[PDB]
Amino acid sequence: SVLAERAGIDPTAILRDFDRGRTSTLPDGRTLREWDIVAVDKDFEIAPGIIFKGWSYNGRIPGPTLWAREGDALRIHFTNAGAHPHTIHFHGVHRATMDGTPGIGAGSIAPGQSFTYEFDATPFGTHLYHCHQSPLAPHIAKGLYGGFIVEPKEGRPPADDEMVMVMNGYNTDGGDDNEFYSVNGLPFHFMDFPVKVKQHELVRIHLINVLEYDPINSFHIHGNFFHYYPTGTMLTPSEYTDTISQVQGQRGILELRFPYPGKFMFHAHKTEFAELGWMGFFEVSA
Amino acid sequence: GGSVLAERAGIDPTAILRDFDRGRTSTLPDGRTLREWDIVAVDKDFEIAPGIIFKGWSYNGRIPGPTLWAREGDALRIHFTNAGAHPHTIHFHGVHRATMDGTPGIGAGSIAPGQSFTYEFDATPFGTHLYHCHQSPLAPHIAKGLYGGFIVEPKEGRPPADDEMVMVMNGYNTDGGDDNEFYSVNGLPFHFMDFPVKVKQHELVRIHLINVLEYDPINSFHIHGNFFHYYPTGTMLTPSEYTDTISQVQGQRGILELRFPYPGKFMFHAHKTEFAELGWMGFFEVSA
Amino acid sequence: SVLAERAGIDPTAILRDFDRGRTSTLPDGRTLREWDIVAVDKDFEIAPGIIFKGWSYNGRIPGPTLWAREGDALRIHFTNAGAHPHTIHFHGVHRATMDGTPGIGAGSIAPGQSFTYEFDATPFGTHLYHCHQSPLAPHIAKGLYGGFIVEPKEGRPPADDEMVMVMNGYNTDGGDDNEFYSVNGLPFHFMDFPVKVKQHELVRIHLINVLEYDPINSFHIHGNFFHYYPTGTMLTPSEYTDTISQVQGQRGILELRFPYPGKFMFHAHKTEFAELGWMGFFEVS
Ligand SMILES: [Ca+2]
Ligand SMILES: [Ca+2]
Ligand SMILES: [Ca+2]
Ligand SMILES: [Cu+2]
Ligand SMILES: [Cu+2]
Ligand SMILES: [Cu+2]
Ligand SMILES: [Cu+2]
Ligand SMILES: [Cu+2]
Ligand SMILES: [Cu+2]
Ligand SMILES: [Cu+2]
Ligand SMILES: [Cu+2]
Ligand SMILES: [Cu+2]
Ligand SMILES: [Cu+2]
Ligand SMILES: [Cu+2]
Ligand SMILES: [Cu+2]
């Protein structure tokens, strides 16, 4: 409901903003993908008159949605511009020194320091990254997370509209509870700016749960059913449903085709979360 | 004194367990079945625990509401009348047009006290579904009792069960706040302790299990001495799991299938102990 | 973490201790497999200076990890040597009188009394047992639970390192909430004594959630992915992932091969649980 320009976050933009990095060919034939990611302390107006003191990768919450193809060599040049030490811990296969865990290898990246995370894009699937500095709750909850999607080498069946949805919460008044919730950064954004999709088109959603404090989050779409692929790691779906649940760190792919035009609500099927920001609409054009 | 007797409580969970409402049917030009129900939202008091009177909002004067049953592809009409003091809707889990979704602000939206609306859609997809009110504030409109099961039988592929039943897991918020004071399957705390679910040894038992529990983020289901195949949302013909314990957040539901190998009493309850001890526990009684 | 000798629990030993019990051959040719289990009250130092008044099976939390082959005839000879009535309720197929439920058959086993639970090892999978005396919460939460592993009749492809991990909590104080969390008995144990595994070898973990009060637990491993088999009841995996959730009573098998040497953290992806004890390392050689 806070306008994107004022809030500092544009959830509509984030929805389809896949950062494929800058590519080059290695002397082995493989593709190299590179990103720069800077941790920066930044204020965000998440609700009318509510300023959230965030810790963010590249000045946005959620952080960049990284995209790679299975097998690619990856380099993430991380610079910490925050007042606190941070890391980037990737969900994916990598060496212990590349794990973003304090005490192992480079460990905590102090303010003003840099480090290059190197690993291969494996396994294929829908993953994520987040800070792993202790105390671990604030370092994730303050905004340090983003999507990491690895497309299978041979590719997936082609989608007409591919998007990313990161579910989070905002702890504004301290304690161990959330005051607001959102998809892609702003409470109620998609109520005022519905997700625009076309009738019958294959929609593919990478749904990632980063919600802290609360043990489980959920996702429901009105009038519609989707195939769900847990972690996006298998090519056949595990469920066909209208409601799925994810604990923190769980994620997957949903695929559907909207059979009818109009507005269809989507939201957490936990009522408390929906009424505090985690609700929106799809607007399906004929 | 035990669980509150059905006659006194105003809900009969045992009857609900096996009451699949097939509606009234007629044949369309095209060969398809037209299946119709009348559903009325009514404010009603229910004695859920001895001396504890829950002021419910109910469809057709029962909590859970009618368990609607259809066959895949049927044309459906639900003739809704709001006889309550507050605006209400019916939002179905199933495929339907936006104007038929029961969401305030979309199409007809909120149904005012005294007013009526016919929800129309096809019975699709096959599976185990549900319906509930979608009026804001969301929590009390579901938690006060406005929900029921909606079962769509596949046209092809599901072996006949010897005993088919429905179990709706809920909670009762009696004193305000964001917490439940009692829990039930099919309406009354501890009913199936006093009136165990009667099944036959070796017979195929098929349960449609639906979670509507508000406030608490997750519910579960465990059966003593037994294992079941579980079909999430009942939308697939092959089971996802073979287990004795499953979990569901609100809005999740599925089919359990089992055959009880031994006669006797077998407890079933939430494997969340708090819920079990506050009414979500019962027995199966397996006859030889 | 508290050292194992002081604590009265050794999580490293528990990790690989599969109790196959005592076996004999029935006239049928079938295996009869038997265990003795005693409920005893015992104090455990779970955190520096924090003494937990436990109710334990055979003086350990978690209790013995029972192992059997599918189809075995089983007998568990139970004696209650505690101050409160107790039972053993098994997750597995059995007759109603063998269910360890108060009011059914022998029901509650009073202090000093004994009962032999008899059933077959069926179905194959990863299971558990725990007390079923009311009030239910303290009777599980005070320590009366353990693993029950039934191997399929034709077997599983062999693991290089097979282990059991029971996730729990400790309610040490007033309210019905947990103050500490662990895998296999001791908060943070595997931080100080990492799980030693070899690079590329098949690791099979029987992961069991017995956590009371909190509705759900989770498991995540850094830099690694595992195949997950819910309840261990199927020979094909349901998921390939790095994070899995279980409510109380849920359990499953995880299978993985570590492709790189070094230390890889494992812990609940519920942050509060990890920071209060449910955190460890794998040390890959
Ligand atoms: Ca707060
Ligand atoms: Ca209350
Ligand atoms: Ca406590
Ligand atoms: Cu950080
Ligand atoms: Cu809905
Ligand atoms: Cu993580
Ligand atoms: Cu809704
Ligand atoms: Cu209503
Ligand atoms: Cu049980
Ligand atoms: Cu719903
Ligand atoms: Cu039980
Ligand atoms: Cu006990
Ligand atoms: Cu991780
Ligand atoms: Cu149990
Ligand atoms: Cu971690």
Coordinates of C-alpha atoms in Angstrom, one line a residue, chain B residues 130-240:
Chain B
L130 CA -13.7 -27.4 1.3
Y131 CA -15.7 -24.2 1.5
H132 CA -15.8 -21.4 4.1
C133 CA -16.9 -17.8 4.6
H134 CA -14.6 -15.1 3.2
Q135 CA -16.0 -12.0 4.9
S136 CA -13.6 -9.7 6.8
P137 CA -12.4 -9.9 9.5
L138 CA -11.3 -13.3 8.2
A139 CA -10.5 -15.1 11.5
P140 CA -13.9 -14.9 13.3
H141 CA -15.8 -15.6 10.1
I142 CA -14.1 -18.9 9.6
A143 CA -13.5 -19.7 13.4
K144 CA -17.2 -19.1 14.4
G145 CA -18.1 -22.1 12.3
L146 CA -18.6 -21.2 8.7
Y147 CA -16.9 -24.1 6.9
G148 CA -17.6 -27.5 5.4
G149 CA -16.2 -30.2 3.2
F150 CA -16.6 -30.4 -0.6
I151 CA -15.9 -33.8 -2.1
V152 CA -15.5 -34.3 -5.9
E153 CA -15.3 -38.0 -6.9
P154 CA -13.1 -38.8 -9.9
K155 CA -15.0 -39.9 -13.0
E156 CA -12.4 -42.7 -13.4
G157 CA -9.8 -44.5 -11.2
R158 CA -10.8 -44.8 -7.5
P159 CA -11.5 -48.3 -6.1
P160 CA -14.7 -48.6 -4.0
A161 CA -14.2 -48.1 -0.2
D162 CA -16.0 -50.3 2.2
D163 CA -16.5 -47.4 4.6
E164 CA -16.1 -43.8 3.5
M165 CA -16.1 -40.9 6.0
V166 CA -15.3 -37.2 6.5
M167 CA -13.3 -35.7 9.4
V168 CA -13.1 -31.9 9.8
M169 CA -10.6 -30.8 12.4
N170 CA -11.4 -27.5 14.1
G171 CA -10.9 -25.3 17.1
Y172 CA -13.1 -23.2 19.4
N173 CA -12.1 -19.8 20.6
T174 CA -14.5 -19.3 23.5
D175 CA -12.9 -16.4 25.5
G176 CA -11.6 -14.1 22.8
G177 CA -7.9 -13.4 22.0
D178 CA -5.9 -15.2 19.5
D179 CA -6.1 -18.7 21.1
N180 CA -8.3 -21.7 21.0
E181 CA -9.7 -23.3 24.2
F182 CA -11.1 -26.5 22.7
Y183 CA -10.4 -28.7 19.6
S184 CA -12.5 -31.3 17.8
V185 CA -13.0 -33.6 14.9
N186 CA -16.5 -33.1 13.5
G187 CA -17.8 -30.5 16.0
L188 CA -17.6 -31.8 19.6
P189 CA -14.5 -32.2 21.8
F190 CA -13.9 -35.8 22.9
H191 CA -17.1 -37.1 21.1
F192 CA -15.3 -40.1 19.6
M193 CA -13.9 -41.1 23.0
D194 CA -17.5 -41.8 24.1
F195 CA -18.8 -42.9 20.7
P196 CA -15.9 -44.6 19.0
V197 CA -15.8 -44.8 15.2
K198 CA -17.1 -48.3 14.3
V199 CA -15.2 -50.0 11.4
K200 CA -14.8 -53.7 10.3
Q201 CA -11.5 -55.6 10.5
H202 CA -9.8 -55.8 7.0
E203 CA -12.3 -53.5 5.3
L204 CA -11.1 -50.6 3.2
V205 CA -11.7 -47.4 5.2
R206 CA -11.4 -44.1 3.3
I207 CA -11.3 -40.8 5.3
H208 CA -11.5 -37.3 3.9
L209 CA -9.5 -35.3 6.4
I210 CA -9.8 -31.5 6.3
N211 CA -8.1 -29.0 8.5
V212 CA -10.0 -25.7 9.2
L213 CA -8.2 -24.9 12.5
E214 CA -7.8 -21.2 13.0
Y215 CA -5.1 -19.4 15.0
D216 CA -2.8 -22.4 15.4
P217 CA -0.6 -22.7 12.3
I218 CA -0.6 -26.5 12.0
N219 CA -2.7 -29.5 12.9
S220 CA -1.9 -33.2 12.8
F221 CA -3.5 -36.7 12.8
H222 CA -2.2 -39.9 14.2
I223 CA -3.8 -43.4 14.5
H224 CA -2.6 -46.0 17.0
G225 CA -1.4 -49.4 15.8
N226 CA -2.2 -48.6 12.1
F227 CA -0.7 -47.1 8.9
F228 CA -2.5 -45.4 6.1
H229 CA -1.8 -44.3 2.5
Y230 CA -2.2 -40.6 2.2
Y231 CA -3.3 -38.7 -0.9
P232 CA -2.8 -34.9 -0.4
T233 CA -5.9 -32.9 -1.5
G234 CA -7.2 -36.3 -3.0
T235 CA -6.2 -35.0 -6.4
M236 CA -4.0 -37.9 -7.4
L237 CA -4.7 -41.6 -7.8
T238 CA -1.3 -42.6 -6.4
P239 CA -0.5 -41.9 -2.7
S240 CA 2.3 -39.6 -1.5

